[PDB]
Amino acid sequence: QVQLQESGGGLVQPGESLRLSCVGSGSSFGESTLSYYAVSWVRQAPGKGLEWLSIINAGGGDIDYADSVEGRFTISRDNSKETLYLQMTNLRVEDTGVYYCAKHMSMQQVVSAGWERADLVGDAFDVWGQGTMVTVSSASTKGPSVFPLAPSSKSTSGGTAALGCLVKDYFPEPVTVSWNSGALTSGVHTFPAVLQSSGLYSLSSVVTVPSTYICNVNHKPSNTKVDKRVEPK
Protein backbone atom coordinates (compact mmCIF):
# COMPACT_ATOMS: atom_id res chain seq x y z
CA GLN A 1 0.00 0.00 0.00
CA VAL A 2 0.89 3.64 -0.52
CA GLN A 3 1.98 5.46 2.62
CA LEU A 4 1.69 9.16 3.42
CA GLN A 5 3.61 11.44 5.74
CA GLU A 6 2.78 15.11 6.25
CA SER A 7 5.16 17.79 7.46
CA GLY A 8 5.54 21.57 7.71
CA GLY A 9 3.16 22.25 10.58
CA GLY A 10 4.03 24.67 13.36
CA LEU A 11 3.08 27.80 15.28
CA VAL A 12 2.39 30.93 13.21
CA GLN A 13 0.95 34.40 13.75
CA PRO A 14 -2.50 35.19 12.37
CA GLY A 15 -2.08 36.65 8.87
CA GLU A 16 1.13 34.75 8.08
CA SER A 17 1.61 32.00 5.50
CA LEU A 18 2.70 28.38 5.78
CA ARG A 19 3.36 25.54 3.34
CA LEU A 20 2.52 21.94 4.22
CA SER A 21 3.99 18.97 2.38
CA CYS A 22 3.02 15.31 2.10
CA VAL A 23 5.33 12.63 0.78
CA GLY A 24 4.09 9.37 -0.65
CA SER A 25 6.03 6.14 -0.33
CA GLY A 26 5.33 2.44 -0.71
CA SER A 27 3.12 1.27 -3.56
CA SER A 28 -0.19 -0.40 -4.35
CA PHE A 29 -1.53 -2.55 -7.20
CA GLY A 30 0.59 -2.69 -10.35
CA GLU A 31 3.34 -1.00 -8.34
CA SER A 32 1.30 2.22 -8.42
CA THR A 33 2.51 5.16 -6.34
CA LEU A 34 0.81 8.30 -5.04
CA SER A 35 1.06 10.00 -8.45
CA TYR A 36 -1.49 7.52 -9.83
CA TYR A 37 -4.14 8.85 -7.43
CA ALA A 38 -6.19 11.90 -6.57
CA VAL A 39 -5.48 13.29 -3.11
CA SER A 40 -7.22 15.60 -0.66
CA TRP A 41 -6.24 17.64 2.36
CA VAL A 42 -8.48 17.21 5.40
CA ARG A 43 -8.15 18.86 8.79
CA GLN A 44 -9.36 18.36 12.34
CA ALA A 45 -9.59 21.22 14.80
CA PRO A 46 -8.85 20.48 18.46
CA GLY A 47 -11.54 18.22 19.92
CA LYS A 48 -13.61 18.41 16.73
CA GLY A 49 -14.44 16.26 13.71
CA LEU A 50 -13.07 16.11 10.18
CA GLU A 51 -13.32 18.88 7.58
CA TRP A 52 -12.48 18.38 3.91
CA LEU A 53 -10.41 21.25 2.52
CA SER A 54 -9.26 20.52 -1.01
CA ILE A 55 -8.79 17.90 -3.71
CA ILE A 56 -6.43 17.55 -6.66
CA ASN A 57 -6.42 14.89 -9.36
CA ALA A 58 -3.43 12.66 -10.15
CA GLY A 59 -2.32 14.83 -13.08
CA GLY A 60 -2.77 18.10 -11.21
CA GLY A 61 -6.21 19.15 -12.45
CA ASP A 62 -9.85 19.23 -11.34
CA ILE A 63 -8.94 21.18 -8.21
CA ASP A 64 -11.62 22.32 -5.78
CA TYR A 65 -11.72 23.94 -2.35
CA ALA A 66 -14.09 24.12 0.60
CA ASP A 67 -15.53 27.62 0.98
CA SER A 68 -13.74 28.01 4.31
CA VAL A 69 -10.31 28.15 2.63
CA GLU A 70 -11.10 29.13 -0.97
CA GLY A 71 -8.98 32.09 -2.03
CA ARG A 72 -6.40 31.57 0.72
CA PHE A 73 -5.14 28.02 0.29
CA THR A 74 -3.60 26.53 -2.84
CA ILE A 75 -3.20 22.81 -3.47
CA SER A 76 -0.54 21.43 -5.79
CA ARG A 77 1.66 18.38 -6.30
CA ASP A 78 5.06 17.41 -7.66
CA ASN A 79 4.73 13.88 -9.01
CA SER A 80 8.43 13.57 -9.82
CA LYS A 81 8.89 13.72 -6.04
CA GLU A 82 5.61 11.96 -5.19
CA THR A 83 4.86 15.00 -3.01
CA LEU A 84 1.73 17.02 -2.31
CA TYR A 85 1.63 20.59 -1.07
CA LEU A 86 -0.88 22.85 0.62
CA GLN A 87 0.09 26.52 0.49
CA MET A 88 -1.81 28.41 3.17
CA THR A 89 -1.94 32.20 3.30
CA ASN A 90 -3.67 34.79 5.48
CA LEU A 91 -4.05 32.21 8.25
CA ARG A 92 -6.56 32.77 11.04
CA VAL A 93 -6.98 31.40 14.54
CA GLU A 94 -9.72 29.02 13.36
CA ASP A 95 -7.34 27.40 10.88
CA THR A 96 -5.75 25.76 13.93
CA GLY A 97 -5.76 21.97 13.87
CA VAL A 98 -4.19 18.76 12.61
CA TYR A 99 -3.83 18.60 8.82
CA TYR A 100 -4.03 15.29 6.99
CA CYS A 101 -3.37 14.40 3.40
CA ALA A 102 -5.62 11.53 2.32
CA LYS A 103 -5.50 9.43 -0.84
CA HIS A 104 -8.70 8.61 -2.76
CA MET A 105 -8.82 4.91 -3.70
CA SER A 106 -9.62 4.90 -7.44
CA MET A 107 -6.68 4.86 -9.85
CA GLN A 108 -6.82 8.10 -11.86
CA GLN A 109 -3.84 7.88 -14.22
CA VAL A 110 -1.18 5.53 -15.54
CA VAL A 111 1.58 7.58 -17.14
CA SER A 112 3.39 4.53 -18.50
CA ALA A 113 0.28 3.62 -20.51
CA GLY A 114 -0.74 7.16 -21.48
CA TRP A 115 -4.04 6.50 -19.70
CA GLU A 116 -6.06 8.98 -17.62
CA ARG A 117 -9.46 8.29 -16.08
CA ALA A 118 -12.04 10.54 -17.72
CA ASP A 119 -13.56 11.63 -14.40
CA LEU A 120 -12.34 12.45 -10.90
CA VAL A 121 -14.01 9.80 -8.74
CA GLY A 122 -13.07 11.22 -5.34
CA ASP A 123 -14.08 7.99 -3.61
CA ALA A 124 -13.01 6.72 -0.18
CA PHE A 125 -9.89 7.90 1.65
CA ASP A 126 -8.06 4.56 1.84
CA VAL A 127 -4.76 5.99 3.11
CA TRP A 128 -4.19 8.82 5.57
CA GLY A 129 -1.00 10.31 6.95
CA GLN A 130 -0.32 10.66 10.67
CA GLY A 131 -1.11 14.36 10.36
CA THR A 132 0.81 17.55 11.03
CA MET A 133 -0.19 20.13 13.65
CA VAL A 134 -0.79 23.77 12.75
CA THR A 135 -1.30 26.33 15.50
CA VAL A 136 -2.24 29.88 14.56
CA SER A 137 -1.82 32.26 17.49
CA SER A 138 -0.67 35.73 18.53
CA ALA A 139 0.88 34.25 21.65
CA SER A 140 4.56 33.45 21.74
CA THR A 141 5.92 29.97 22.31
CA LYS A 142 7.00 28.90 25.79
CA GLY A 143 8.96 25.75 26.49
CA PRO A 144 8.10 23.35 29.31
CA SER A 145 9.69 23.01 32.71
CA VAL A 146 10.18 19.34 33.55
CA PHE A 147 10.03 18.22 37.17
CA PRO A 148 10.38 14.69 38.52
CA LEU A 149 7.48 12.92 40.20
CA ALA A 150 9.53 10.92 42.64
CA PRO A 151 8.56 7.54 44.08
CA SER A 152 8.74 7.41 47.86
CA SER A 153 8.74 4.77 50.57
CA LYS A 154 5.17 3.74 51.43
CA SER A 155 4.09 4.71 47.91
CA THR A 156 3.53 1.06 46.99
CA SER A 157 -0.07 0.36 45.98
CA GLY A 158 -1.10 -2.92 44.49
CA GLY A 159 2.27 -4.63 44.17
CA THR A 160 3.68 -1.75 42.14
CA ALA A 161 5.50 1.59 42.36
CA ALA A 162 4.81 4.74 40.34
CA LEU A 163 7.11 7.50 39.12
CA GLY A 164 6.78 10.20 36.48
CA CYS A 165 7.53 13.61 35.04
CA LEU A 166 5.53 16.80 35.42
CA VAL A 167 5.72 18.78 32.18
CA LYS A 168 4.56 22.25 33.13
CA ASP A 169 3.85 25.68 31.67
CA TYR A 170 4.22 25.33 27.90
CA PHE A 171 2.56 26.64 24.74
CA PRO A 172 1.37 25.58 22.28
CA GLU A 173 0.49 21.91 22.03
CA PRO A 174 1.92 19.39 21.70
CA VAL A 175 4.69 17.75 23.69
CA THR A 176 5.84 14.18 23.20
CA VAL A 177 7.17 12.11 26.08
CA SER A 178 9.14 8.88 25.96
CA TRP A 179 10.97 6.94 28.68
CA ASN A 180 14.59 5.78 28.58
CA SER A 181 14.75 6.79 24.92
CA GLY A 182 11.89 4.41 24.15
CA ALA A 183 13.38 1.33 25.82
CA LEU A 184 10.64 1.52 28.46
CA THR A 185 7.06 1.37 27.17
CA SER A 186 5.12 -1.05 29.40
CA GLY A 187 2.91 0.69 31.95
CA VAL A 188 3.36 4.22 30.61
CA HIS A 189 0.52 6.74 30.71
CA THR A 190 0.94 10.21 29.30
CA PHE A 191 -2.06 12.30 30.29
CA PRO A 192 -3.87 14.75 28.02
CA ALA A 193 -2.66 18.31 28.56
CA VAL A 194 -4.82 20.62 30.66
CA LEU A 195 -5.06 24.34 29.98
CA GLN A 196 -4.25 26.33 33.11
CA SER A 197 -5.61 29.75 34.07
CA SER A 198 -2.23 31.20 33.12
CA GLY A 199 -3.03 30.24 29.52
CA LEU A 200 -0.26 27.64 29.56
CA TYR A 201 -0.57 23.87 29.30
CA SER A 202 0.47 21.27 31.84
CA LEU A 203 0.79 17.52 31.53
CA SER A 204 2.11 14.52 33.43
CA SER A 205 3.65 11.28 32.24
CA VAL A 206 3.85 8.38 34.65
CA VAL A 207 5.11 4.82 34.61
CA THR A 208 4.42 1.88 36.90
CA VAL A 209 7.32 -0.42 37.69
CA PRO A 210 7.18 -3.44 39.98
CA SER A 211 7.61 -2.58 43.67
CA THR A 212 17.42 4.23 36.37
CA TYR A 213 14.46 6.09 34.85
CA ILE A 214 14.74 9.02 32.45
CA CYS A 215 11.91 10.84 30.71
CA ASN A 216 12.58 12.47 27.37
CA VAL A 217 10.42 15.51 26.71
CA ASN A 218 10.15 17.13 23.30
CA HIS A 219 8.35 20.37 22.50
CA LYS A 220 9.15 21.27 18.88
CA PRO A 221 7.65 24.78 18.75
CA SER A 222 10.24 25.88 21.32
CA ASN A 223 13.07 23.60 20.17
CA THR A 224 12.94 21.92 23.57
CA LYS A 225 14.58 18.54 24.03
CA VAL A 226 14.98 17.65 27.70
CA ASP A 227 16.05 14.43 29.40
CA LYS A 228 15.19 14.36 33.10
CA ARG A 229 16.42 11.66 35.45
CA VAL A 230 13.86 10.55 38.03
CA GLU A 231 15.13 9.16 41.34
CA PRO A 232 13.62 8.47 44.78
CA LYS A 233 13.49 11.26 47.36
Partner: protein
Amino acid sequence: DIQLTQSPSSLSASVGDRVTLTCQASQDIRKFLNWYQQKPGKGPKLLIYDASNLQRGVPSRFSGGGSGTDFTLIISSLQPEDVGTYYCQQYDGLPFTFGGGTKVVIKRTVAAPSVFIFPPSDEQLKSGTASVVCLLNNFYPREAKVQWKVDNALQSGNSQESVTEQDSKDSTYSLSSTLTLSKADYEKHKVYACEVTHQGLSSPVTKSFNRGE
Protein backbone atom coordinates in the same frame (compact mmCIF):
# COMPACT_ATOMS: atom_id res chain seq x y z
CA ASP B 1 -23.44 21.19 1.70
CA ILE B 2 -24.77 17.75 2.62
CA GLN B 3 -25.12 17.25 6.38
CA LEU B 4 -24.48 13.86 7.94
CA THR B 5 -25.97 13.24 11.38
CA GLN B 6 -24.57 10.40 13.44
CA SER B 7 -26.32 8.81 16.40
CA PRO B 8 -25.90 8.20 19.06
CA SER B 9 -23.10 10.66 19.90
CA SER B 10 -21.61 8.11 22.26
CA LEU B 11 -22.38 4.44 22.70
CA SER B 12 -21.51 2.08 25.53
CA ALA B 13 -21.48 -1.67 24.99
CA SER B 14 -19.95 -4.84 26.41
CA VAL B 15 -17.29 -6.94 24.69
CA GLY B 16 -19.05 -9.44 22.44
CA ASP B 17 -22.09 -7.22 21.92
CA ARG B 18 -23.52 -6.61 18.46
CA VAL B 19 -23.26 -2.85 17.91
CA THR B 20 -25.06 -0.66 15.38
CA LEU B 21 -23.97 2.86 14.42
CA THR B 22 -26.27 5.01 12.28
CA CYS B 23 -25.72 7.84 9.82
CA GLN B 24 -28.47 10.03 8.38
CA ALA B 25 -27.86 12.25 5.35
CA SER B 26 -29.81 15.46 4.77
CA GLN B 27 -30.33 14.37 1.17
CA ASP B 28 -30.29 11.22 -0.97
CA ILE B 29 -26.65 10.23 -1.50
CA ARG B 30 -27.33 6.80 -3.01
CA LYS B 31 -24.45 4.57 -1.84
CA PHE B 32 -21.67 7.16 -2.01
CA LEU B 33 -20.94 6.76 1.69
CA ASN B 34 -17.81 5.66 3.55
CA TRP B 35 -17.03 4.81 7.18
CA TYR B 36 -13.82 5.52 9.09
CA GLN B 37 -12.41 4.64 12.49
CA GLN B 38 -10.16 7.06 14.36
CA LYS B 39 -8.26 6.26 17.52
CA PRO B 40 -7.17 9.12 19.78
CA GLY B 41 -4.08 10.90 18.46
CA LYS B 42 -4.06 8.79 15.28
CA GLY B 43 -5.14 9.34 11.68
CA PRO B 44 -8.43 7.86 10.44
CA LYS B 45 -8.58 4.42 8.83
CA LEU B 46 -11.06 3.32 6.18
CA LEU B 47 -13.44 0.52 7.19
CA ILE B 48 -16.28 0.49 4.66
CA TYR B 49 -16.47 2.07 1.21
CA ASP B 50 -19.58 2.69 -0.89
CA ALA B 51 -21.96 1.78 1.94
CA SER B 52 -21.35 -1.99 2.14
CA ASN B 53 -17.85 -2.94 0.92
CA LEU B 54 -15.35 -4.10 3.52
CA GLN B 55 -11.93 -2.61 2.83
CA ARG B 56 -9.12 -5.13 2.40
CA GLY B 57 -7.46 -5.99 5.70
CA VAL B 58 -10.26 -4.68 7.90
CA PRO B 59 -11.61 -7.33 10.29
CA SER B 60 -14.73 -9.08 8.98
CA ARG B 61 -16.78 -8.28 12.11
CA PHE B 62 -17.35 -4.87 10.48
CA SER B 63 -20.14 -4.56 7.93
CA GLY B 64 -22.02 -1.66 6.39
CA GLY B 65 -25.52 -1.24 5.03
CA GLY B 66 -28.13 1.17 3.73
CA SER B 67 -28.65 3.63 0.88
CA GLY B 68 -30.29 6.96 0.14
CA THR B 69 -30.33 8.82 3.46
CA ASP B 70 -30.06 6.02 6.05
CA PHE B 71 -26.89 4.02 6.73
CA THR B 72 -25.53 1.66 9.37
CA LEU B 73 -22.14 0.40 10.44
CA ILE B 74 -22.44 -2.87 12.31
CA ILE B 75 -19.83 -4.44 14.55
CA SER B 76 -21.00 -8.02 14.95
CA SER B 77 -18.95 -8.65 18.08
CA LEU B 78 -17.40 -5.66 19.83
CA GLN B 79 -13.74 -6.03 20.74
CA PRO B 80 -11.78 -3.93 23.25
CA GLU B 81 -9.51 -2.63 20.47
CA ASP B 82 -12.66 -1.17 18.89
CA VAL B 83 -12.82 1.80 21.28
CA GLY B 84 -12.57 5.09 19.43
CA THR B 85 -14.56 7.38 17.18
CA TYR B 86 -16.34 6.42 13.98
CA TYR B 87 -17.12 8.83 11.16
CA CYS B 88 -19.27 8.49 8.08
CA GLN B 89 -18.43 10.46 4.94
CA GLN B 90 -20.33 11.32 1.80
CA TYR B 91 -19.10 11.95 -1.73
CA ASP B 92 -22.31 12.27 -3.73
CA GLY B 93 -21.29 15.91 -4.14
CA LEU B 94 -18.65 18.48 -3.24
CA PRO B 95 -17.84 19.63 -0.74
CA PHE B 96 -17.11 16.23 0.77
CA THR B 97 -18.49 16.14 4.31
CA PHE B 98 -18.19 13.98 7.41
CA GLY B 99 -20.60 13.08 10.19
CA GLY B 100 -19.84 14.47 13.65
CA GLY B 101 -18.70 11.04 14.79
CA THR B 102 -19.89 8.38 17.21
CA LYS B 103 -17.63 7.51 20.12
CA VAL B 104 -17.62 3.85 21.15
CA VAL B 105 -17.01 3.05 24.81
CA ILE B 106 -16.49 -0.39 26.39
CA LYS B 107 -18.46 -1.57 29.41
CA ARG B 108 -16.41 -3.89 31.61
CA THR B 109 -16.16 -5.18 35.18
CA VAL B 110 -15.35 -2.80 38.02
CA ALA B 111 -11.65 -2.40 38.79
CA ALA B 112 -10.41 -0.39 41.77
CA PRO B 113 -7.69 2.24 41.25
CA SER B 114 -4.24 2.04 42.76
CA VAL B 115 -3.46 5.43 44.30
CA PHE B 116 -0.14 7.29 44.53
CA ILE B 117 0.75 10.75 45.80
CA PHE B 118 3.78 12.87 44.86
CA PRO B 119 5.17 15.93 46.65
CA PRO B 120 6.58 18.87 44.65
CA SER B 121 10.20 18.41 43.58
CA ASP B 122 13.03 20.55 44.94
CA GLU B 123 13.73 22.12 41.54
CA GLN B 124 10.17 23.44 41.38
CA LEU B 125 10.05 24.94 44.87
CA LYS B 126 13.37 26.58 44.06
CA SER B 127 11.23 28.64 41.65
CA GLY B 128 8.29 29.69 43.84
CA THR B 129 5.52 27.28 42.79
CA ALA B 130 4.36 23.97 44.29
CA SER B 131 2.58 21.22 42.35
CA VAL B 132 1.27 18.23 44.31
CA VAL B 133 0.19 15.27 42.19
CA CYS B 134 -2.22 12.40 42.81
CA LEU B 135 -2.40 9.43 40.45
CA LEU B 136 -5.24 6.93 40.11
CA ASN B 137 -4.01 4.04 38.00
CA ASN B 138 -5.89 1.53 35.85
CA PHE B 139 -9.47 1.57 37.13
CA TYR B 140 -13.06 1.26 35.94
CA PRO B 141 -15.57 2.88 35.77
CA ARG B 142 -14.30 6.35 34.87
CA GLU B 143 -16.23 8.21 37.55
CA ALA B 144 -14.03 8.87 40.58
CA LYS B 145 -13.92 11.53 43.27
CA VAL B 146 -10.56 12.97 44.27
CA GLN B 147 -10.54 15.28 47.26
CA TRP B 148 -7.52 17.23 48.44
CA LYS B 149 -6.85 17.91 52.11
CA VAL B 150 -4.10 20.12 53.50
CA ASP B 151 -3.57 19.66 57.23
CA ASN B 152 -7.03 18.08 57.07
CA ALA B 153 -8.62 21.14 55.44
CA LEU B 154 -10.83 20.33 52.47
CA GLN B 155 -9.34 22.05 49.43
CA SER B 156 -11.26 23.41 46.43
CA GLY B 157 -10.72 25.54 43.33
CA ASN B 158 -6.98 24.93 43.19
CA SER B 159 -6.82 21.55 41.46
CA GLN B 160 -7.19 20.13 37.95
CA GLU B 161 -7.87 16.58 36.80
CA SER B 162 -6.86 14.83 33.60
CA VAL B 163 -8.07 11.43 32.43
CA THR B 164 -6.56 9.08 29.85
CA GLU B 165 -8.51 7.68 26.92
CA GLN B 166 -10.05 4.27 27.59
CA ASP B 167 -7.29 1.66 27.22
CA SER B 168 -7.49 -0.39 24.02
CA LYS B 169 -6.37 -3.61 25.72
CA ASP B 170 -8.08 -3.70 29.15
CA SER B 171 -10.63 -0.86 28.80
CA THR B 172 -9.53 0.94 31.98
CA TYR B 173 -8.81 4.60 32.69
CA SER B 174 -6.14 6.44 34.62
CA LEU B 175 -6.50 9.86 36.21
CA SER B 176 -4.25 12.54 37.66
CA SER B 177 -5.25 15.35 39.99
CA THR B 178 -2.84 18.25 40.43
CA LEU B 179 -3.11 20.56 43.43
CA THR B 180 -1.28 23.82 42.75
CA LEU B 181 -0.37 26.38 45.41
CA SER B 182 2.33 29.01 45.97
CA LYS B 183 5.58 28.12 47.71
CA ALA B 184 4.46 30.37 50.56
CA ASP B 185 1.28 28.38 51.14
CA TYR B 186 2.92 24.98 50.67
CA GLU B 187 5.38 25.93 53.41
CA LYS B 188 2.58 27.03 55.74
CA HIS B 189 1.14 23.51 56.14
CA LYS B 190 2.50 20.02 56.88
CA VAL B 191 0.13 17.19 55.93
CA TYR B 192 -0.86 16.71 52.29
CA ALA B 193 -3.51 14.13 51.50
CA CYS B 194 -5.35 12.78 48.47
CA GLU B 195 -8.66 11.08 49.31
CA VAL B 196 -10.11 8.91 46.56
CA THR B 197 -13.71 7.68 46.35
CA HIS B 198 -14.64 5.03 43.80
CA GLN B 199 -17.16 2.24 43.23
CA GLY B 200 -14.43 -0.40 43.41
CA LEU B 201 -13.35 0.70 46.89
CA SER B 202 -15.40 -0.33 49.92
CA SER B 203 -14.48 3.03 51.47
CA PRO B 204 -12.41 6.09 50.51
CA VAL B 205 -8.66 5.54 50.22
CA THR B 206 -6.26 8.19 51.48
CA LYS B 207 -2.65 8.67 50.46
CA SER B 208 -0.67 11.41 52.18
CA PHE B 209 2.76 12.69 53.13
CA ASN B 210 4.37 15.08 55.61
CA ARG B 211 6.21 18.01 54.04
CA GLY B 212 9.97 17.50 54.02
CA GLU B 213 10.02 13.81 54.93
